[PDB]
Design an enzyme around this catalytic site. Structure first.
Site, PDB file in Angstrom:
ATOM      1  N   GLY A 107      -0.907  -2.875  -3.142  1.00  0.00           N
ATOM      2  CA  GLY A 107       0.042  -3.422  -4.095  1.00  0.00           C
ATOM      3  C   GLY A 107      -0.313  -3.218  -5.555  1.00  0.00           C
ATOM      4  O   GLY A 107       0.537  -3.475  -6.417  1.00  0.00           O
ATOM      5  N   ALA A 108      -1.523  -2.758  -5.873  1.00  0.00           N
ATOM      6  CA  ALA A 108      -1.994  -2.729  -7.255  1.00  0.00           C
ATOM      7  C   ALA A 108      -2.232  -1.329  -7.808  1.00  0.00           C
ATOM      8  O   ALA A 108      -2.672  -1.202  -8.959  1.00  0.00           O
ATOM      9  CB  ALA A 108      -3.280  -3.554  -7.398  1.00  0.00           C
ATOM     10  N   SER A 182      -1.063   1.102   1.651  1.00  0.00           N
ATOM     11  CA  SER A 182      -0.766   1.509   0.265  1.00  0.00           C
ATOM     12  C   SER A 182      -2.071   1.658  -0.502  1.00  0.00           C
ATOM     13  O   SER A 182      -2.911   2.480  -0.091  1.00  0.00           O
ATOM     14  CB  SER A 182       0.247   0.547  -0.349  1.00  0.00           C
ATOM     15  OG  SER A 182       0.819   1.142  -1.506  1.00  0.00           O
ATOM     16  N   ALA A 183      -2.292   0.911  -1.593  1.00  0.00           N
ATOM     17  CA  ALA A 183      -3.593   0.926  -2.241  1.00  0.00           C
ATOM     18  C   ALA A 183      -4.703   0.574  -1.269  1.00  0.00           C
ATOM     19  O   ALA A 183      -5.821   1.078  -1.405  1.00  0.00           O
ATOM     20  CB  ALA A 183      -3.614  -0.048  -3.421  1.00  0.00           C
ATOM     21  N   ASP A 301       9.049   5.990   3.321  1.00  0.00           N
ATOM     22  CA  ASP A 301       8.057   5.447   2.391  1.00  0.00           C
ATOM     23  C   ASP A 301       8.473   5.614   0.935  1.00  0.00           C
ATOM     24  O   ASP A 301       8.212   4.737   0.113  1.00  0.00           O
ATOM     25  CB  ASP A 301       6.697   6.116   2.594  1.00  0.00           C
ATOM     26  CG  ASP A 301       5.720   5.263   3.377  1.00  0.00           C
ATOM     27  OD1 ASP A 301       4.913   5.864   4.105  1.00  0.00           O
ATOM     28  OD2 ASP A 301       5.721   4.019   3.236  1.00  0.00           O
ATOM     29  N   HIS A 416       8.648   1.609   2.351  1.00  0.00           N
ATOM     30  CA  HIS A 416       7.259   1.346   2.020  1.00  0.00           C
ATOM     31  C   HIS A 416       6.908  -0.092   2.366  1.00  0.00           C
ATOM     32  O   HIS A 416       7.664  -1.019   2.061  1.00  0.00           O
ATOM     33  CB  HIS A 416       7.000   1.628   0.540  1.00  0.00           C
ATOM     34  CG  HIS A 416       5.551   1.577   0.146  1.00  0.00           C
ATOM     35  ND1 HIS A 416       4.576   2.339   0.759  1.00  0.00           N
ATOM     36  CD2 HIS A 416       4.917   0.858  -0.811  1.00  0.00           C
ATOM     37  CE1 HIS A 416       3.409   2.096   0.191  1.00  0.00           C
ATOM     38  NE2 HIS A 416       3.590   1.206  -0.769  1.00  0.00           N
TER      39      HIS A 416
HETATM   40 ZN   LIG Z   1      -0.332   0.041  -3.983  1.00  0.00          ZN
END
Ligand SMILES: [Zn+2]
Ligand SMILES: [Zn+2]
Ligand SMILES: [Zn+2]
Ligand SMILES: [Zn+2]
Ligand SMILES: [Zn+2]
Ligand SMILES: [Zn+2]
Ligand SMILES: [Zn+2]
Ligand SMILES: [Zn+2]
Length: 514
Positions: A107-108, A182-183, A301, A416
């Site tokens: 998320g970051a 994700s991250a 995604d 995503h």
């Molecule tokens: Zn991310």
């Protein structure tokens, strides 16, 4: 059949026992175990001092300091490096030698994770934890004054603590699987590539993110360190002097200091530092020679991000035109100039001759973003992992289950992060919000994931699976497509290989322009 007080390196820890069903099954839950000291702004994490007596691990602790939803304030705290553990328990004895899965959230780089369903359905231990994000996790000058990657070091500290301590909870420390999205998927990948983790990790799962995705490595950190300093009033003429001023700026001001396509606005992310990341991640895959590896993506995604770059896709009221797409394509291919913009535009709009409908054009924008942000980086990582494998197995998946009605009734897909709720068993934890077939998909994903955790073979373990997941090789290029109705045809091959070859062969050979 309960843990009670658990002996850790720092002292005794007491969690809670939640009885499940009526025959004697339960789960032990630990929340807020420190794995490193209270953080210092832009400094590497440190051991947490031991404690006397019994630590009551009953509540989640604060998250690391980070910008709110509307970029106007902060939440979290500098005292944030805590982890949480779910241990499933049977009727007879307390569990021992269980596989251990450590979740890394995302998320970051571009919120509530409860490990109970995975743990109990898969008979594994689940660990969650916090790491530092944003400027406080990744600010850097690119040199030894402010080397960056603080958040990656936090993650490594939590994994090392698990290796040292998990046996007392009933875990097998030689059988640690990382998994993340994700991250967090990119972080999982980076952890498998760092020399820091040799001997710590048995296997890994990257969900919608690998170290090779273009939003993962900041190659101009010094430019971003300067933008923050100039906003917080630090001098920008010297590296060693700006760094020290940043280290004594109010961490909330550092966080809020900073508020063209979406990818040009990826800022405070990992850097190639010559230390935690010794080289470009593409040159590091020998470090994962003996780490079994699943990597995969969602078949839509890129849709959320195409929507930011082109809101016209989400309303038949408006149109996407060739000129809009050329502009988007051209900014992504800048380093290859006009020639690179055209070859890419031409390849992606080839189907527009036969199908000029706005359904096909808007889908092409989504596919383009999916390809360059997720699918192609993931396919390169799979090939690279396969190429360097000694004992390691490699597996590819495509997650395609829809949760909601699409914009066009042919856009059957998962966007995503849609995968997280199924991996975490939410259709079983809160079943009234979900359909029967959702529980079918969640049941299968937990089975594959925790079989893989136990054995390195998603087909082999405590759970039955719907279809045989064939290991990826250079020759088969196989991937499992995950849907609500799986059978032998769910094992496919060669996902969008014409676009893979375009990006890896054709586009790479074009000259670089200045
Ligand atoms: Zn991310
Ligand atoms: Zn503490
Ligand atoms: Zn504080
Ligand atoms: Zn044992
Ligand atoms: Zn270390
Ligand atoms: Zn974009
Ligand atoms: Zn969508
Ligand atoms: Zn097979």
């Amino acid at each position: 059949s309960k843990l009670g007080a658990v002996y850790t390196e720092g002292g005794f820890v007491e969690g809670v026992n939640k009885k499940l069903g009526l025959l004697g099954d339960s789960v032990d839950i630990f929340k807020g175990i420190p794995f490193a000291a209270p953080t210092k702004a832009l400094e590497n994490p440190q051991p947490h001092p031991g404690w006397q007596g019994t630590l009551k691990a009953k509540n989640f602790k604060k998250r690391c300091l980070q910008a709110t939803i509307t970029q106007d304030s902060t939440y979290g705290d500098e005292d944030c490096l805590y982890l949480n553990i779910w241990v499933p328990q049977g009727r007879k004895q307390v569990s021992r030698d269980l596989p251990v899965m450590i979740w890394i959230y995302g998320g970051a780089f571009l919120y509530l994770y409860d490990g109970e369903e995975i743990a109990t359905r898969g008979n594994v231990i689940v660990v969650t934890f916090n790491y530092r994000v944003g400027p406080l996790g990744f600010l850097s000058t690119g040199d030894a004054n402010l080397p960056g990657n603080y958040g990656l070091r936090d993650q490594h500290m939590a994994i090392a603590w698990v290796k040292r301590n998990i046996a007392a909870f009933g875990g097998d420390p030689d059988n640690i699987t990382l998994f993340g999205e994700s991250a967090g998927g990119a972080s999982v990948s980076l952890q498998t590539l760092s020399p820091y983790n040799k001997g710590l990790i048995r296997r890994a799962i990257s969900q919608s993110g690998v170290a090779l995705s273009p939003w993962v490595i900041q190659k101009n950190p010094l430019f971003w360190a300067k933008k923050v300093a100039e906003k917080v009033g630090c001098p920008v003429g010297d590296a060693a002097r700006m760094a020290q001023c940043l280290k004594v700026t109010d961490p909330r001001a550092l966080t809020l200091a900073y508020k063209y396509p979406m990818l040009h606005y990826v800022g405070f992310v990992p850097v190639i530092d010559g230390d935690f990341i010794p080289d470009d991640p593409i040159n590091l895959y020998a470090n994962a020679a003996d780490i079994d590896y699943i990597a995969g993506t969602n078949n839509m995604d890129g849709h959320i991000f195409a929507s930011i770059d082109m809101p016209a896709i989400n309303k038949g009221n408006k149109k996407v035109t060739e000129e809009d797409f050329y502009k988007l394509v051209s900014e992504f291919t800048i380093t290859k100039g006009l020639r690179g913009a055209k070859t890419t535009f031409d390849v992606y709009t080839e189907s527009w001759a036969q199908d000029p409908s706005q359904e096909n054009k808007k889908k092409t924008v989504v596919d383009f973003e999916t390809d360059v942000l997720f699918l192609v980086p993931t396919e390169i990582a799979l090939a690279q992992h396969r190429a360097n494998a000694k004992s390691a197995k490699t597996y590819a998946y495509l997650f395609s289950h829809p949760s909601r009605m699409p914009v066009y009734p042919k856009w059957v897909g998962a966007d995503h992060a849609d995968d997280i709720q199924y991996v975490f068993g939410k259709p079983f934890a809160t079943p009234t919000g979900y359909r029967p077939q959702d529980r079918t998909v969640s049941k299968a994903m937990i089975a594959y994931w925790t079989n893989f955790a136990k054995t390195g073979d998603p087909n082999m373990g405590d759970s039955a699976v719907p279809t045989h997941w064939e290991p990826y090789t250079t020759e088969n290029s196989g991937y499992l497509e995950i849907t609500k109705k799986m059978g032998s045809s769910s094992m496919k091959r060669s996902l969008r290989t014409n676009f893979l070859r375009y990006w890896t062969l054709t586009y790479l050979a074009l000259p670089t322009v200045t």
